[PDB]
Amino acid sequence: VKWECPAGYEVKEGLNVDFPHKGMKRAFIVYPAKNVSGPAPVWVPMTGSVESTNDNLTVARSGANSILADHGYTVIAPVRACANQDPNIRGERCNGPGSNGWNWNPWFEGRAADPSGEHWKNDEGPDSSFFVAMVQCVGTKYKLDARRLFLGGICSGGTMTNRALLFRSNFWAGGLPISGEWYVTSDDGTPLSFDDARAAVAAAPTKIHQGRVGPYPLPAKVGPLIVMTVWGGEKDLWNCTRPDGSRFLCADYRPSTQAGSNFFSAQPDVVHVACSSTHGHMWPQLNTQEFNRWALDTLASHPKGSDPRSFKLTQPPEGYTCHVGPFTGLYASAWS
């Protein structure tokens, strides 16, 4: 990691706007760590399709992620490009299909199913690179621990966490993709419909599946990481909204959390923790702050470059079941 900012950019505590990156003007909010001397671990929380960044940071039911600063983490929270730097935008002009080859508009988190997405098969996209520039700039003002830079998020922010970990595994120390997509494809990269992607994982639940969330093909080896993937149970599903207001199922997080866990668990320098809860498709609801504390401290216990054999999982809060390895309670096993 290199600490540097766009020339003349003056980072500040709180809201930062007009940060220049790849021709766009971006914004992000900084909450410096409390009760910490020396470099602090970093948490980069990302909202989803409808909650605002302010909701994700300050509303309890949305995770109140800014409270992690009171827990000793410097929180650096990006605003979605579609929100035009307004951290209060919720779903307006954000909650819907993407443009310019992107699948979904909240974040540049997956290539589209049509040929316009081809270019994103091997270019991380402007959000993955923005986050790296953002953290590198904040680190010129606040002391950040370069071995403990973590990002994470819910829904589309979870999908973005997955993309960022696959393209920038030599920067981040790990992440927390909560109910994010994988956009499972065939091995040859062919995009699959929601239905066909869902069936592919059910038919081969322990295999590594390619997906539009990441590089095509997925990398043979990624940098050292700890990744904690969270599934919200039977109701962890998303219904899209048509132009006419009607709703329809368009994402099921059982196959995407399984697929992510298969890929990350197979990686030799990655500790993968699979966590299950029953809250559905939203920020973890049972003992929310206890979960945020447990999850970030778990990630922080595996600083970048740590030996996976040295990792020791502690019990999560009531309402969660977690273990090291791929998910196992989502599909019936072969031997069964």
Side-chain angles (χ1 to χ4, degrees):
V1 181
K2 190 174 190 187
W3 306 118
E4 45 175 24
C5 287
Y9 193 82
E10 309 159 277
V11 184
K12 61 182 220 46
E13 165 168 11
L15 182 63
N16 288 259
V17 299
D18 295 327
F19 180 85
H21 191 73
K22 290 178 170 173
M24 306 184 71
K25 298 297 191 47
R26 303 304 297 270
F28 56 91
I29 301 170
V30 176
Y31 301 77
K34 295 291 194 42
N35 299 321
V36 172
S37 67
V42 168
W43 168 227
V44 175
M46 292 174 289
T47 194
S49 297
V50 173
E51 293 162 311
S52 64
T53 289
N54 183 25
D55 288 330
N56 175 269
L57 293 166
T58 64
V59 174
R61 77 168 311 116
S62 292
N65 278 277
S66 71
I67 301 314
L68 277 142
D70 286 331
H71 198 58
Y73 291 74
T74 285
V75 179
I76 304 169
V79 174
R80 288 177 291 171
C82 59
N84 299 139
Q85 302 193 66
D86 180 351
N88 294 302
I89 279 279
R90 282 181 169 148
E92 304 101 319
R93 300 168 288 287
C94 281
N95 178 30
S99 293
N100 298 305
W102 294 101
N103 188 69
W104 200 240
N105 210 41
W107 302 104
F108 300 113
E109 38 88 309
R111 61 189 171 95
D114 63 271
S116 71
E118 177 79 11
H119 177 54
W120 303 121
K121 284 177 163 176
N122 280 290
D123 183 320
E124 62 186 328
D127 266 331
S128 178
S129 60
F130 162 48
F131 307 151
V132 171
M134 175 187 74
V135 170
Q136 285 180 151
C137 177
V138 174
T140 64
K141 189 176 156 51
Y142 295 107
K143 295 185 188 169
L144 309 182
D145 180 341
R147 293 184 68 204
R148 286 187 176 82
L149 306 177
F150 297 115
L151 86 173
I154 177 66
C155 183
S156 183
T159 307
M160 184 69 238
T161 296
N162 280 332
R163 183 171 188 92
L165 290 170
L166 295 165
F167 282 97
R168 283 288 186 155
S169 64
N170 296 304
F171 180 75
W172 303 104
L176 178 63
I178 305 177
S179 305
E181 257 287 11
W182 199 256
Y183 301 129
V184 169
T185 65
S186 302
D187 288 342
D188 64 5
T190 298
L192 298 175
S193 59
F194 162 63
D195 280 348
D196 284 355
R198 194 190 211 179
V201 175
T206 63
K207 63 157 282 178
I208 288 172
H209 293 266
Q210 299 298 313
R212 297 185 282 129
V213 68
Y216 177 70
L218 291 173
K221 189 174 179 187
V222 300
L225 295 172
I226 171 165
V227 177
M228 179 178 294
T229 300
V230 183
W231 177 58
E234 300 289 320
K235 298 302 201 186
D236 189 358
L237 299 169
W238 181 250
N239 298 119
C240 280
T241 304
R242 306 198 178 84
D244 70 4
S246 53
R247 303 296 291 284
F248 66 97
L249 182 64
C250 58
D252 177 343
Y253 299 89
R254 178 197 306 269
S256 64
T257 57
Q258 181 74 60
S261 78
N262 292 354
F263 175 81
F264 289 117
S265 297
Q267 287 294 313
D269 299 337
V270 177
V271 169
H272 184 267
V273 173
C275 281
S276 297
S277 192
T278 53
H279 62 291
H281 195 58
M282 55 195 320
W283 197 272
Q285 297 291 110
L286 302 169
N287 298 314
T288 300
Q289 290 299 318
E290 281 185 54
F291 176 77
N292 293 354
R293 289 189 289 267
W294 174 79
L296 264 293
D297 294 349
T298 293
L299 295 184
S301 78
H302 200 65
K304 199 176 181 59
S306 284
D307 185 345
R309 296 185 164 273
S310 74
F311 178 77
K312 295 184 155 289
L313 187 66
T314 62
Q315 186 179 302
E318 183 172 15
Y320 304 82
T321 300
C322 309
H323 60 89
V324 176
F327 280 94
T328 52
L330 281 55
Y331 297 94
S333 76
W335 183 226
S336 217

